[PDB]
Amino acid sequence: RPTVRPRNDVAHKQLSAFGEYVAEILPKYVQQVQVSCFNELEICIHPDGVIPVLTFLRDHSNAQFKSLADLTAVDIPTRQNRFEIVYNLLSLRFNSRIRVKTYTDELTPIESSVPVYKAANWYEREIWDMFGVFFANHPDLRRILTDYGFEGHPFRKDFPLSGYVELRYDDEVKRVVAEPVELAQEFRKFDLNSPWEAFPAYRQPP
Amino acid sequence: MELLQVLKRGLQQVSGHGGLRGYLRVLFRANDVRVGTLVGEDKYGNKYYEDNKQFFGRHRWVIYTTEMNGKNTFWDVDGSMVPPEWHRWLHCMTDDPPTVKPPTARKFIWTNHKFNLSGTPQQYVPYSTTRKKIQEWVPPSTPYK
Amino acid sequence: SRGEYVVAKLDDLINWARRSSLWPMTFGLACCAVEMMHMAAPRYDMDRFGVVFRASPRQSDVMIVAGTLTNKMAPALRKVYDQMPEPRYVVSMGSCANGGGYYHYSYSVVRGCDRIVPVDIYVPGCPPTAEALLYGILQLQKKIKREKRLRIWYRR
Amino acid sequence: NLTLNFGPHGVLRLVMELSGEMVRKCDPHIGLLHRGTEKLIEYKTYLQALPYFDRLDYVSMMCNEQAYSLAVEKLLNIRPPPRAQWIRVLFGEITRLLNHIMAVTTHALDIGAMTPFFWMFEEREKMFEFYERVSGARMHAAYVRPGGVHQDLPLGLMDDIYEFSKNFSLRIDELEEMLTNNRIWRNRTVDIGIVTAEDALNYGFSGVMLRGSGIQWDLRKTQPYDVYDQVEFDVPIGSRGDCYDRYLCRVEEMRQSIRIISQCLNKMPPGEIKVDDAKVSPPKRAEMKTSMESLIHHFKLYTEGYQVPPGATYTAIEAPKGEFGVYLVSDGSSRPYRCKIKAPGFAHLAGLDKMSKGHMLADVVAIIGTQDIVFGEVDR
Amino acid sequence: GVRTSPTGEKVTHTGQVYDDGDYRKVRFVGRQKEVNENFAIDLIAEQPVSQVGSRVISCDGGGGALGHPRVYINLDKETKTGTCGYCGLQFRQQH
Amino acid sequence: QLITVDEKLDITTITGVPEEHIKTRKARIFVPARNNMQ
Amino acid sequence: ASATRFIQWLRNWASGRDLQAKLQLRYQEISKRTQPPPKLPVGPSHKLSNNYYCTRDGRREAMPPSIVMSSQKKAVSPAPPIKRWELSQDEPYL
Amino acid sequence: SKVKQDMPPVGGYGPIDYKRNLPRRGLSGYSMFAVGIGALLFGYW
Amino acid sequence: TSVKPIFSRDMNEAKRRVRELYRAWYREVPNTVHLFQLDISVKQGRDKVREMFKKNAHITDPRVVDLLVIKGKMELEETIKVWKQRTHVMRFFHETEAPRPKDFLSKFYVGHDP
Amino acid sequence: LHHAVIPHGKGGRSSVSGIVATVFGATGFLGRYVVNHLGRMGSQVIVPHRCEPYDTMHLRPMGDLGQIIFMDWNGRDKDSIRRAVEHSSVVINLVGREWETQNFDFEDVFVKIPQAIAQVSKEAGVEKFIHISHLNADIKSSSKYLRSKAVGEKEVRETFPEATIIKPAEIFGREDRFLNYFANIRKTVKQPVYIVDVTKGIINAIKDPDARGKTFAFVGPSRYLLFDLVQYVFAVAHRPFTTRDKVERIHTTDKILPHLPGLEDLGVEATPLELKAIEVLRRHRTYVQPAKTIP
Amino acid sequence: TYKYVNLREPSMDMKSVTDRAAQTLLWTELIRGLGMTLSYLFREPATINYPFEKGPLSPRFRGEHALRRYPSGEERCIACKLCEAVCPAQAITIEAEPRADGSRRTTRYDIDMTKCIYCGFCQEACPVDAIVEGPNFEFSTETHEELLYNKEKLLNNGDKWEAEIAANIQADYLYR
Ligand SMILES: CCCCCCCCCCCCCCCCCC(=O)OC[C@H](COP(=O)(O)OCCN)OC(=O)CCCCCCCCCCCCCCCCC
Ligand SMILES: NC(=O)C1=CN([C@@H]2O[C@H](COP(=O)(O)OP(=O)(O)OC[C@H]3O[C@@H](n4cnc5c(N)ncnc54)[C@H](OP(=O)(O)O)[C@@H]3O)[C@@H](O)[C@H]2O)C=CC1
Ligand code: SF4
Ligand code: SF4
Ligand code: SF4
Ligand SMILES: [Zn+2]
């Protein structure tokens, strides 16, 4: 079928088998395992298990996920633990990828994974900067992307797109100053969602 | 030797621009004394030349008019002086000049091209094109309290 | 009179020198810097106009703001502007520098570099082509040609 | 230990601790080009967010578009048609040439070898013309889209790409004559910024930052996309893990890119260039102006956009600078819920302090260059 | 169809013009108010009504795929003409 | 090792919001009405 | 292309290459800037029958993830080990 | 009529070079040293 | 209601960190005024430090206090290492901001906001 | 109020203050602060200028797009004045020169030009007029600068009775010719006033309906002996401790005019010289007990 | 498949060692580098003589915007707002009302050219070919305000450039 993405059952079965393998070996930490219809494996864990689970996947002979592809956060305000912490890992030995997910809120530290991957250093600084998730035992946790003295965590869903302050050069004080934001043209919010359901397969129970 | 054949070509550019005065005029106006074939001339006085033996990019050029829309352009030439019909040909968006493929005539098309007017009294000034949205109540012109 | 005539010729001389030797300091902030590089590249060769490829800020006559100016960067840009010896001109190049562009509604972006420094020429585009930038530099030259510093000096 | 508040793509603030000539500490301060791209994307439809990817590694525009398109196509469960896939490989490799020219010649220009920049940037200008002829723009084409490409090649383009490609390896040869055997160039690059294979993996490196140190990894080979499994090419591998080997890898990759381009020109197939599914890809204008279904779908695709089934994907490609990926989260609507951009230069620059150990100040310029850093993608 | 106001300012095709006490017209002092003088309402009115022999006619604005989406215009009423909603051309059923 | 906290969860001081846009705002929590046109 | 025979010899000798065969300036070998109109083909879904969208609706074949374990025998690797690359036969060494 | 889209010429395009081509040049170390010493000896004489 | 602590296990431990941070800030102001060549006085800088601490005096959650101290230490580091420029230090003082009126009548005259 | 000049917004750059101000002399020391404060709150500023446009560039960033408008003018051309004021609700005259030139003497700059602006403004219907005079303005002064100020102050009041007239002492500030003047030196009591205080008073005088028809005197909080002031300046500048007319003015004791309102009557609190002296004199340091005030 | 870029053993015979000594002492590889820059001196440069010559462009080029008309002079734009909806930068602002003759037309059509990313999405979205990006790229201005285009400016651009815009559309519309 020319327009439809072909399925890959063989990879789906392999990744499912490995997902059970991980769950059996680390029952203390694994809460959910799932494989998407495009064959990506996700391990959902208790936050206490960040270091043991990541170490296992890096070092175990049947895993060897030696490369941390990416580390990021997602803000979901409706959840009690609004922040989802996503680790994307790559195994060159087995030419495979795995995603490890955990959660935290605004006041609960997550264990820094710099001991497992040195790559994690800056990714965790960015998560702290943009989302305000604190990582315990980080060698140097501080803002990385925002301005010095910037207040707030911009990537949170309740942070306004245009922020609270804006900058200009003021001649009286002969320096750049920060003042409350005023826009000559307000950003125009669009309501795009169709009132008609698009995907029956994902309908939620009433 | 070819050195002689090169020097002869140098001397033919002098006669190809109409003697020394014409050769010097293009040298100082355009910094280029190449001789090409005259493709045509627009109503403003710009002249368009081609030489297909030059490499792509140098094979078409315009010698701008010395006066356009009441401005002295002997020294102050501008890329915005090229009218649209020749703009297409000069930038190689097409192979055929407006002398062979004239543009389609329309009643509303500008008959007089204008160059960049920024910095002059003719410059564009923005403004809101919509009318007033709320009408205020006008009190009566007579007294009654 | 001759006194007015002498002033008119001297203004032409200093204007000719200043527009014939425009040394730019390029703030290569983002993608617009790439098109600035293509203007120095062989096809357009800005050096042939007297515009040297890269001057030091203390030997510069024109600042080209070529990219997005973030809030974190704004103080540094103003500091370099204040260190430029006069006469000094600013060319704002690209939508980002002009008015914020694609990132106009961002929390971290200055909505136009003209909030930080005075701007002489605005070059539109995202990015402007190398040729469009060259058109803008030539437009700045014509602006300098119109200056009458000495004429106004002697009518003071 | 002396401290410098700034030493040596964009703008970087490097805070360095020196002891005589030797660099003891290298603390990059980035964010000078952070423009909140990832947040802005949440307010856009999937189509509206596509141009943001041109402006990340704004030397590798169409490769960035490809990564985003592949991610959306995966979530949509559709596939681009074969001709679009070949066009995407063809321009991905043209884009690799664009990037590698910039990477190598500005690396040379930074340490004084200024002339190859000019020779090769006339070749860049000619490839800018290929971009402009397919898309109308020289850089930010917005040409590769989810479902295929925006327009078919204009007649005559493939001939000119062939003409450019036929002569290009000679231009590389002239670049190599200036640098490859030059003792000054070797003095500036050999045994500079050595990274071991294990450290490179654990620091999150990718691309030439891996292969320079001997690791046999290239996503075009191991995790192939659109049609990379149908073209033949070699992966260049280093042996010393230093700047000079990474320079050689990039130069050889340019040669292999031409080799791929030659195959794409010959094996380019006929057909449509975007998915024949008008709930994803807009219909042709002639259909939009005659058929009711086409007009509705055009109207809806350009106002609401297509809905993407809920889900999350990490999709990556072998971009010219290394592994470029997006972690894209769909909530079922026509706007992405979250879009994290994995930029290879982010991890690479994070490793500058490690790589600069035991080197002199002038070596920091060489190491930054060897990493090929564009702050459009580092800062996003 | 450019008309001017008592103050002298040209009136645009959308009817815009600053009133007498409006400070905002200071922006035009020493410069000019850009006004397009090819009023589309006056230009379309000059087009003749097209006589046709059917109750229904189709318009695509001319030029095939270069015009507008093709629409069908009913011409059953004899009081008025059928007007294309896209391009403003008018039609009339003859006899 | 966990600790015991009985304070009502309040993060106003660590979110960075200007004081004006906490105290003087009124949030409206609701399910949107169906658009009557569809 | 306008170089004299002597000057062509001088630069060919200095560079060591036959520069004239591969000039970096384009001349008449480039394609014409006016081309005949195209006539592009249509895709596989351009049919008048046997073409119901529900048989080619990729988006609606997407499914939620398969939950293999929820908190509510031989060892395996995530995939088979990667195969050793083979040294190129085009040119194994530079 | 017929579909007309940008396609490769029938039979494909000609071969494209891509391999490194740094040709060998000059004399050997022995000959170069000989010419240099020969110049010195003539100069000294 | 059993939670993972950040640094402090209770308010008494948390308030020790607060006092330590205040001492560090208090001693840093004179250097900051000189290093950044500020036109404010050392007393003004210390009065501003006290004002910033005082507005958070109502917090009783040790985890919130820990984050405030964590963020306060980051801000102090940015100042001591001169990662901030003069503009950043002076942003605490809102010099170019006009006095916002507070009483009901003043707000009524200017606009609609409360 | 015409609908276009009803205030809107929160008093910032993109707001609408409702002020349409023509500022003559906008390119000088005091002009740049007046324009800045006007542009801070979203006023429409018309800047008539005699100088090259290059010299007005520092004023462009002080307003949102469209809020600063520049026009050519000539002090001796009443049509150029009419063009500049006929749309404004307030006209501010800051034209002055601390010296005479071949083309403009103190009479032209402080009498004829201010009177012509006042007359044309009155004819054009401008409702508010603000004229800066001088605290020491006096027909019987030894300085012809201060004599011309007195005559001009009289003419402006006669020509535009509702004009607000403001009389500052010598103004200190970054670009002043007071502290900078002393720092460049290689009986009399002064009461100098800070530039920002004078600017704030002018802005408030525009917003205060009581300011119409009044004459104000803007002075600093303390009086100093000139010798003690110069001694203080040299100490702050870390320096080991011109025209005939300028020297006369510097040696003129600042007048005491309790019968006039001052900065306090407009809501401005006078800034002491001690809090701003280093701001001005720091640039004079090659890399402090305050002056004794008259009690 | 892979290759080694830098994995070779130098020959340690006397002839080879003496070859490398001669290179070290006589700077042969440096002299060879001088040869290449010498050959470029005698090549024709690639510079074009702007503004008398221009870089080549294609009909698809995305430049300055313009609003187009029908042959009768009627505006093509019918205020559908598809362009405004698609604009990635929110650069377009539109108001509309029934015209005095009942036609569906705009009263405001603004493009902030300093928000615009010149992406061309508006001209793809337009159902009537009303808004286009034209061929002009030489419209830099001395002020920010001059780049805030209202409808009158955009209609004037269309009347100014229509000759070239129509020809360019004629060359590319079969690829659209
Ligand atoms: C019979 C009895 C006779 C006895 C006497 C016999 C003597 C003859 C035999 C000896 C020959 C002596 C050669 C003298 C030249 C200097 C040689 C030299 O120093 O070269 C080595 C130097 C560094 O070499 P390097 O690769 O870095 O490695 C060495 C460190 N391990 O490498 C360098 O210096 C490189 C130079 C760097 C500068 C590059 C820029 C210049 C390149 C262009 C130069 C053109 C030639 C100059 C001609 C000038 C003419 C006036
Ligand atoms: N500064 C002080 O200490 C005090 C000043 N004042 C008064 O306050 C006002 C401003 O002071 P200040 O700003 O310091 O004066 P400045 O000299 O700093 O600025 C003078 C202004 O007047 C303009 N101007 C001068 N002469 C002419 C002229 N002949 N034609 C047109 N415009 C002219 C200048 O324009 P250009 O730049 O184009 O010449 C400039 O904008 C003056 O009236 C001054 O007397 C009163 C008391 C104290
Ligand atoms: S204006 Fe466009 S090209 Fe220039 S920096 Fe901004 S996004 Fe990049
Ligand atoms: S070109 Fe793109 S950014 Fe510009 S107006 Fe059109 S859709 Fe908006
Ligand atoms: S320009 Fe086209 S897309 Fe935009 S409102 Fe007008 S008709 Fe609709
Ligand atoms: Zn019609």
Tab-separated table of N, CA and C in Angstrom, chain D residues 7 11 64 73 81 84 100 155 168 171 191-192 196 215 223 244 250 252 267 275-276 331:
chain	number	residue	atom	x	y	z
D	7	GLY	N	37.369	34.279	25.238
D	7	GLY	CA	38.419	34.027	24.286
D	7	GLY	C	37.883	34.014	22.867
D	11	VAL	N	27.601	33.278	18.420
D	11	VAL	CA	28.436	33.984	19.385
D	11	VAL	C	28.578	33.128	20.632
D	64	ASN	N	17.816	19.194	8.356
D	64	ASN	CA	16.960	19.443	9.512
D	64	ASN	C	15.493	19.226	9.164
D	73	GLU	N	6.000	11.872	9.833
D	73	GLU	CA	5.517	10.764	9.018
D	73	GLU	C	5.371	9.496	9.848
D	81	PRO	N	6.313	9.226	-1.093
D	81	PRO	CA	6.449	8.390	-2.289
D	81	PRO	C	7.899	8.257	-2.716
D	84	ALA	N	9.928	11.347	-3.995
D	84	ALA	CA	10.223	12.289	-2.923
D	84	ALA	C	11.380	11.792	-2.068
D	100	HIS	N	29.816	20.724	4.989
D	100	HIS	CA	31.222	20.365	5.129
D	100	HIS	C	32.133	21.434	4.550
D	155	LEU	N	12.211	21.388	-14.708
D	155	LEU	CA	12.913	20.780	-15.827
D	155	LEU	C	14.277	21.427	-15.998
D	168	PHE	N	33.281	18.906	-9.164
D	168	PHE	CA	33.465	19.308	-7.779
D	168	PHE	C	34.649	18.621	-7.111
D	171	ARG	N	37.677	20.604	-7.058
D	171	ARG	CA	37.697	21.661	-6.056
D	171	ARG	C	38.151	21.122	-4.705
D	191	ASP	N	47.225	15.490	16.750
D	191	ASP	CA	47.291	15.248	18.193
D	191	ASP	C	46.653	16.374	18.996
D	192	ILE	N	45.688	17.067	18.406
D	192	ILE	CA	44.927	18.106	19.083
D	192	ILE	C	43.534	17.560	19.353
D	196	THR	N	39.070	9.527	23.217
D	196	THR	CA	39.051	8.077	23.127
D	196	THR	C	37.659	7.595	22.747
D	215	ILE	N	35.286	4.561	15.948
D	215	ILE	CA	34.002	3.890	16.108
D	215	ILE	C	33.324	3.782	14.752
D	223	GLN	N	20.906	2.533	10.799
D	223	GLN	CA	19.476	2.789	10.943
D	223	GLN	C	19.013	3.628	9.753
D	244	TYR	N	43.062	16.462	13.197
D	244	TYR	CA	43.497	16.194	11.834
D	244	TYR	C	42.735	15.025	11.230
D	250	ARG	N	35.940	14.533	7.300
D	250	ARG	CA	34.998	15.441	6.659
D	250	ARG	C	35.310	15.614	5.182
D	252	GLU	N	36.796	13.441	3.231
D	252	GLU	CA	36.431	12.212	2.540
D	252	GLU	C	34.920	12.076	2.427
D	267	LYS	N	19.444	7.084	-10.653
D	267	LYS	CA	18.341	6.237	-10.223
D	267	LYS	C	17.094	7.024	-9.844
D	275	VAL	N	2.806	12.512	-0.685
D	275	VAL	CA	1.935	11.368	-0.460
D	275	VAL	C	0.572	11.635	-1.075
D	276	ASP	N	0.078	10.669	-1.850
D	276	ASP	CA	-1.223	10.800	-2.499
D	276	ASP	C	-2.316	10.516	-1.468
D	331	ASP	N	-0.425	15.023	20.991
D	331	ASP	CA	-1.577	14.825	21.858
D	331	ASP	C	-2.845	14.498	21.082
